[PDB]
């Protein structure tokens, strides 16, 4: 959160997070959504866009990121945790 907003997350363009509210292993994705919907992270980048799909069909949360360079990152956020996903996101921003 704080580190992400500090590093500014400039190259990123699009950030999808999709999930089903009734699946169990989802609170990690919800925390990711929260920290990405925080004020400073979205204020740093207005051209960037975040999209939260609350689709109920299926039982598999997923995360997706598209960068200005065009790189495509995907996370199966079922057996993953919030801080881990954030560290991976920061590392790929560094990339």
């Amino acid at each position: 959160a704080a580190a992400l907003a500090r590093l500014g997350l400039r190259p990123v363009k699009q950030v999808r997070v999709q999930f089903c509210p009734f699946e169990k292993n989802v609170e990690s994705t919800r925390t990711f959504l929260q920290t990405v919907s925080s004020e400073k992270v979205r204020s740093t980048n207005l051209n960037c866009s975040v999209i939260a799909d609350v689709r109920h069909d299926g039982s598999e949360p997923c995360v997706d990121v598209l960068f200005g360079d065009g790189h495509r990152l995907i996370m199966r956020g079922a057996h993953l945790t919030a801080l881990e996903m954030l560290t991976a996101f920061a590392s790929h921003i560094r990339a």
Partner: protein, 167 residues
Amino acid sequence: SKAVTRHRRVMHFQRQKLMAVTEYIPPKPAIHPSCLPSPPSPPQEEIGLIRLLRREIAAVFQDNRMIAVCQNVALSAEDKLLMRHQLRKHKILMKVFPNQVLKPFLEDSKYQNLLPLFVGHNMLLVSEEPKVKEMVRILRTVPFLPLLGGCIDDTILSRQGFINYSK
């Protein structure tokens, strides 16, 4: 030398033997008092906070018509206050409540299909009449909809269910 001195006057050897013999040997059981015993905790008392909260949530649910919840987007304070402004223009009653206290109520208010829904941060918004079109057009005017698994007129609906009920 004198008895009283600034420095610690070294004592006689016999006296030091006596002082080395005489100490507090703490009476300890053979078993450490933590690993084995495991004492039970008292029946912690219940508080007027949760009492009033239960009464308030009852007055909410057993008096309104439409219920919904949406994840706390956590946007700016002024922007969120403007949000609340137009939402109260649209009459919706929007609040939050701690999950730690709301889950037990949800376990006996005949709402046990929602217990998995509530976790982390959230925002609960209710009406006496449906405001589905306006709430959903606000929540799709925003760049991402946080709504999830809300219940109207004692009927649990999803996002697609809300769209259907609005059309």
